[PDB]
Structure formats: structure tokens, C-alpha cells
From a paper:
α-Helical coiled coils are ubiquitous protein domains, found in a wide range of structural and functional contexts. The structure of coiled coils is understood at a level unrivaled by any other fold. They consist of at least two α-helices, wound into superhelical bundles and held together by a mostly hydrophobic core. We find that they indeed break the α-helices to form short β-strands, which associate into a triangular supersecondary structure we name the β-layer. β-Layers are found, also repetitively, in natural coiled coils, where they form regular fibers with alternating α- and β-structure, a protein fold that has not been described so far.
As part of that study, we identified a putative TAA in Actinobacillus actinomycetemcomitans, OMP100, which carries insertions of 2 and of 3 residues within the heptad repeats of its stalk. The insertion of 2 residues extends a heptad to the 9-residue motif IENKADKAD and occurs between three N-terminal and two C-terminal heptads carrying N@d layers; the insertion of 3 residues is directly downstream. For structural characterization, we therefore expressed residues 133Q-198K, covering the two insertions and the five N@d layers, fused N- and C-terminally to the trimeric form of the GCN4 leucine zipper, GCN4-pII. The construct yielded a typical α-helical CD spectrum and, upon heating, unfolded cooperatively with a transition midpoint at 91°C. We obtained crystals in space group C2 that diffracted to a resolution of 2.3 Å, with one symmetric trimer in the asymmetric unit. The structure showed a continuous heptad coiled coil with two discontinuities. Thereby only the central three residues of the motif, KAD, deviate from α-helical structure. All three fall into the β region of the Ramachandran plot, but only the central residue, alanine, forms backbone hydrogen bonds with the alanine residues of the other chains. We call this structural element a β-layer. Here it directly connects two α-helical segments, where the C-terminal one is rotated counterclockwise by ~120° around the trimer axis, as viewed from the N-terminus.
Residue numbers in the entry:
A (entry chain C), B (entry chain B): 104 to 231
C (entry chain A): 105 to 231
The structure:
């Protein structure tokens, strides 16, 4: 009788409450199902950006290569101070050379004066 | 007894529906769980791979150092063609030199013949 | 009889269902959170990737360093040649020295000659 109509009253109340929870549950699963797929795309985007970075790195030059170069550069820099000295030796060998040419033209002229004297002397002596 | 029966029927239909909805929820839920654990695995791997790239990046050369080297190299190259006309000046000095060497020996040769002819003049004088 | 027995069943199915729902709620909640973590982790990763992309925009390519390496080995090959030349300076310096010497040899021979001649000029005027 009414014990039944109370169990039924309880049974309906539970059922209605169960229905609200399911609706609310379904909603939540939709919220999370959508996020997890936006995450799956966000992470497949990233792993492909990273394979680009991995690649774009296989292209950038080592640091050891560029520290060899800065050594070999400073090596050649120093060799330029070893063979910058023998530039001012040229400007010194040209002025001395020139001096030597001047003295040589002066020596020649003395010889030609001398030769003229000796021509004179050989004549004076045969004229006796 | 035929209102208690109508409500009971309403419940049996409602229960069957709720059961069917719960089966939908479970497998749906399962899949979001399955997918979210992938996304987690994917995002931590990517984390590892991002790290790897951060290190590799650290072993590559900063452009500014490579740009230094370029400039230094060019300024070395500047002061190297600069010392090509140094040796241009040499080839003139070497020839100008051998022109002086050939003179000096001729000068000597005229001088030796002068000496001889003086020795002659002197001997000619004493005998008179 | 036959009402009481359906109601009995119904109450057992409700209880069964209440457990399924309370189990479902913590599954969902767990998965919700795991996805909120996944979401931030993947947003962070994209920020880190985006620091690596910006650190790649401050490094030199292989081509440019390869170039520098060639430019250098040239300047080594170009110098080394020129280095062999400039030993020809040392040759002019000592040869100039020998000359300087031969000239002072010559200059002094001449002065002794001038002297002899000065005497001869006089001796011939003395006849
Ligand atoms: Cl997720
Ligand atoms: Cl370099
Ligand atoms: Cl260099
Ligand atoms: Cl990610
Ligand atoms: Cl990266």
C-alpha cells in the first residue's frame, strides 16, 4: 500500500537526481574530450616545430670551427708583423743604392779626368 | 492495481535508458583517458627533445664571432696586397744592383790598365 | 506479490547505478586534471621551442664559417709564397755591403793614382 507508494516516491526522486547527474556528467566529458583533442593537435604541432629546430641546427656552424679560424687569423696577423719589417728595408736599400750610384758617377768622372791627364803625360814624355 | 503499474513501467523504461547512457559514458570516458595519456607521453618526449635542442644550440657559434673573423680576415687581406708592390720594388733593386756590379768591375778594369801605364810612365822617367 | 518484486529489482538497479556514477565522476575528474596538465605542459613547450627558434636566429651558418676557413688557408698560401721572396732582401743587403767595400777599395786606389800623377806631372816639368 502506502509503503509501496513511498518506495516509489523514493525511487522517482533518486531517478530524477540520477538524470541531472548524467546530463552534467555528459557535459563534462564533452569539455574534456574537446580539450584533449586540442592538446593532441598542439603537441603534434610542437613535435614538428622541434624537428624543424633539430634540422635548422644541423646547419649552424660549430664553435670549435670558429675558434680554429680566430686562431689561424691571429696567426696570420702575427706573420704580417714578421713581414712588415722587410718593407722598410726596401726604402733603405733604395736610398743606399742611390748613394752608391752617385758615388759611381763620381768615380767614373775621376777616371775620365785621369785618363785625359795620362794621355797628356805619354805625349810630353815621347816629345824628348 | 493499475496506477502503481503505470509508474513502474515508466521507471523500467527510464532505468533502461539510464543504463544505455552510462555505457556511452564509460567507453567515451575510456577513450579520453587513453588519448590524454598519449598526449602526456607526447608532451614529455617533446620536452626531452626541446632540451636536446637547447644543448646542441649551445655548441654552435654566435654569429658576431663569425662576423669578427670575416672583418679581421679582410683587414689581413688588406695588408697583404699592400705587400705585393713591396716585392715589385725589389725586382727593380735587383736589376739596378746588377747594373752597379757590372759597372764596378769595368771601373776596376780601367783602373788596372791605368796602373800598368803609370808603372810604364814612371820607368820611362827614371831612365831619362 | 508481483509489484513488490519489481520494486525490489528497481532498488537494486538504482544502487548499482549510483556506484557506476560515483566511479565515473572520479574517472572524469582525474582525466579532466590530466588534460589541464597536458595543456599547460604543451603551452610551455611551445614557449621553450620559441626560445630555441630565437636562439637559432643568433648563430652562423656552416657556409659562412666554411668561407672563413677558405679565406684563411688562402692568406696562409699567399703569405707563405711572399715569405720565400723576402729572403731576397737579405741577398741585396750583403751584396750591397760587398759593393760598399769594393768602392772604398776603388776610391782609395784612385787617390793613390792622383798622387802618383801629381808627382809625375812635376817630374816631367823638372827635366
Ligand atoms: Cl589531454
Ligand atoms: Cl670563423
Ligand atoms: Cl687571416
Ligand atoms: Cl607539447
Ligand atoms: Cl626546440
Amino acid at each position: 500500500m502506502k509503503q509501496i507508494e513511498d518506495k516509489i516516491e523514493e525511487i522517482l526522486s533518486k531517478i530524477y537526481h540520477i538524470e541531472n547527474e548524467i546530463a552534467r556528467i555528459k557535459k563534462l566529458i564533452q569539455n574534456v574530450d574537446v580539450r584533449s583533442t586540442e592538446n593532441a593537435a598542439r603537441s603534434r604541432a610542437n613535435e614538428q616545430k622541434i624537428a624543424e629546430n633539430k634540422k635548422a641546427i644541423e646547419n649552424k656552424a660549430d664553435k670549435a670551427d670558429v675558434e680554429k679560424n680566430r686562431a689561424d687569423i691571429a696567426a696570420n696577423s702575427r706573420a704580417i708583423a714578421t713581414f712588415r719589417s722587410s718593407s722598410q728595408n726596401i726604402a733603405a736599400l733604395t736610398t743606399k743604392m742611390k748613394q752608391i750610384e752617385d758615388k759611381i758617377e763620381e768615380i767614373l768622372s775621376k777616371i775620365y779626368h785621369i785618363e785625359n791627364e795620362i794621355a797628356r803625360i805619354k805625349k810630353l814624355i815621347k816629345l824628348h
